[PDB]
Design a protein around this ligand. Structure first.
Ligand SMILES: [Cl-]
Ligand SMILES: [Cl-]
Ligand SMILES: [K+]
Ligand SMILES: [K+]
Ligand SMILES: [K+]
Ligand SMILES: [K+]
Ligand SMILES: [K+]
Lengths: 280, 280, 280, 280
């Protein structure tokens, strides 16, 4: 199987309030809403019971009634204060002091969690479906390409092309090792349209003299990581992708995406790869 | 035409709620306000209809009246609760529980979007109108300069001078390639007033022995990117600019901006470039 | 004793509102809550006294009563406004203008402090209990390992292995010096499961020809720092750890954690270290 | 005079709502409060006038009275809604819809500006009062030192020592140039107590064979920049300082600050510099 999925995430399987902030960001929206709606009603229900424990302390409430106690809580906590249900004495007015404070502080935090979850940036970067190993500038070169899917530019953009493969030590240790493949240009200070990433395969490159045969044997994989500062979000963005030997087009050439000055960019041609065809 | 505009942005033309966070930051203020004002009234209108669906559940409302239902919603959602229009029974008080929560959470988020849009930092950096190619320290050197337009300093400031030009491969591939021009000083840990950026043209420089003639031929362009941590905003800032061959003053020398100790800085002289004039 | 504790923090002992923001983040939750609850009641108590200083300016209050004045403040500050206690005249309505503003601005800030304290990211990274000095790729190599304790990946992850030891200058100055040990791979662009960090001990390494004997003599310590961008938090995370000579297993080999494709990762084996046993 | 003050800021003198976000962060607290208090009253005053323009639309208001109109605004904007002054008809209830929204959005933003200004981190770093040029490891070395003034550590801490001095080009151009002095250790991944920063003066150092005489002549200055990630704030912090020739103690040696294991750190000795005294 694939050690790395095509989105860069790993295949491998792993083996209450300890990691609260992580879980409140990663848990699904249905759970998250429920969880907030849970705390909301539970806190009002606990405050209501305290109002009833004081005695008949809500001006137009039914004596010993939770419903009335509960709704007087949501009016105090939300700071609506219609004025039909109003507190009586020092205990009911102290609890109001405490509940108005709980309500103001608490909900403000729940809403910044909602915002945190909602204001997540995404690098609108599109990775080419395949990689090509063709001769460029008199040297076989491993290539792939990225494109921005938005008008806005990406500042100090850098890319990492990593070979991940099985190896055998000088002693006899069989381990998977990551190689960070040296690229002609790893940083593009302003990435706005398209970028073909090239790794010239030389006597220093870990894939020197390596054929499709030998790449499949070491179960070689190529993991790509793009990172850059987005202008639209004014935040740093990241994007990642992973390829296998089945996703390398030996001899393939990427088709030009820039048309016509009046210059254009067709993202149809983005995954288009040219190839010479030998005689049958 | 110009591949890069003078502000660094590219010329080239590209070819509902999928990219919500990006669009809510990039859409214009008139659209943004409308969009928030839209949701505001639409949510109150949907809550109003639910109050009417329960029956005569608003204490001083006209029966079957939306206006009354609607304004009781904006008083509940905004948590004003005047007390003339007050809820009756369990359904109207449940909807209030839900609407007070919707109103508190929702508006808090809309206001942090307003803040996000409003609290954007700008590197108050001014790029010189032209570049000069003059002999400095016994070597022709490509220069340009930046100035800070505020009192506050910029920490860990770095600049990238990138040559972008048409090239032909050893095979015959005609492609545009970016060169990151090596500068005498790419980082200024504390940038506060002015910085002349120099690229000494040597046998390693991509513009070695290159004249205005040959630079226009490869439709050469120079893209500059400034980045640094601003003290005033306590955030990182960035600024960018682009030049063409028409914006290079061969033999030009930048005029000194620092006057008189009692030292000064005249930003008039900032774009002023000295030049020798040959006999006619 | 240990110059560095096992969590990386130093042993050494050091020798009102000057550092407010730091202290409001570092002070304990019991102090922090008290401090907020303090300001809350103190501000309402100061506003109450001003209402009493105006005269009988609260519609259904007992004349000269602080309790009534105080609760009318918490209803104004929290913006509950039940309507039983309502202001009378220009002074009571001006103070309301001022208190509603104080209450809105103040509590909003107290809640973002609560959020700041609550939304702290933690690199769920587990450092191996020991380090090993075994021959890997025909060179004795100092190793240790890290593991991620969450599904979510860590982007642009880097690790620093620092030797900290007593030294004597060419003059005769006895000082403690930190060496940043060169690692085969200091950056893992995508760290998701496990990473064995290796420092090949060569004629350039500060621990060349160094035995347990000589390492204890210079009271050598090894400090590890992990840093990376977390996907779950969408923030940068950091983690650190420190070892002594008693925590180095000479000849030790880390046990493989990756089982079986159907690949797994047992974190039991994570601290497991294999060792050859000489004949007695 | 001093080109750079001792806090790193430059001496040199420079020569409505264009830079709003910068000015709202840099303007003084008295101006800032006034500015917010300004907008607050001005917005309520503009809303009041609109309520009066509708006619007698406030239930218990005096007809044609601004005071009453104004206070009904602050009760609507702050969302207090006591209920004595309540809106009448569609125009007064529409304006309430608009003002409750203006009040909720507006104040939320004003409070995040208050927070932004208040939650500024400071690197509690103390720079030594002087620098020393003494022989360390058989080479004259320019040194200075930093200390942390808090328990909490500073992660990925880096320091820049920059020589700033007057120079003359191979042509005859007299310019001030910054040299970034190469340090034995520019990065301390974990800075918690003290760090002596050393620049070994070698045939590559810009201050090679340079005496106090020649350093004063080129009006040499030394600018130091410290940057690092603070644990307490969970943010990056920075600190800077500048020295002149009058602040260099030729032959000086920094006194040890670490006492006694039971290790200590006396910050009294921090500025203490030892010196040999020649015979008179
Ligand atoms: Cl916020
Ligand atoms: Cl925030
Ligand atoms: K309210
Ligand atoms: K409110
Ligand atoms: K109310
Ligand atoms: K209210
Ligand atoms: K009311």
């Amino acid at each position: 199987p694939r050690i790395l999925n095509s989105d860069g995430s790993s295949n491998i399987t792993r083996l209450w309030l300890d990691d609260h902030y992580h879980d409140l960001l990663t848990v699904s929206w249905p759970v998250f809403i429920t969880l907030i709606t849970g705390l909301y009603l539970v806190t009002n229900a606990l405050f209501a019971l305290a109002y009833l424990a004081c005695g008949d302390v809500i001006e137009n409430a039914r004596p010993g009634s939770f419903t009335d106690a509960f709704f007087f809580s949501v009016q105090t906590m939300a700071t609506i204060g219609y004025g039909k249900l109003i507190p009586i004495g020092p205990l009911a007015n102290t609890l109001v002091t405490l509940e108005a404070l709980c309500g103001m502080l608490g909900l403000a935090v729940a809403a910044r969690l909602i915002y945190a979850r909602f204001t997540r940036p995404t690098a609108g970067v599109l990775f080419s479906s395949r990689m090509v190993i063709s001769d460029f500038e008199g040297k076989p070169t491993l290539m792939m390409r990225l494109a921005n899917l938005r008008i806005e530019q990406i500042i100090e953009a850098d890319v990492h092309l990593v070979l991940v493969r099985s190896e055998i030590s000088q002693e006899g240790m069989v381990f998977r090792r990551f190689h960070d493949l040296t690229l002609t240009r790893s940083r593009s200070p302003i990435f706005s349209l398209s970028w073909t990433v090239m790794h010239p395969i030389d006597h220093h490159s870990p894939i020197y003299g390596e054929t499709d045969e030998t790449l499949r044997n070491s179960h070689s994989e190529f993991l790509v990581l793009f990172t850059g500062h987005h202008e639209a979000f004014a935040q740093n963005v990241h994007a990642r992708h992973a390829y296998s030997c089945d996703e390398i087009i030996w001899g393939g050439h990427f088709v030009d995406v820039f048309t016509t000055g009046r210059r254009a960019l067709d993202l149809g041609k983005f995954h288009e790869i040219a190839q010479h065809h030998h005689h049958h």
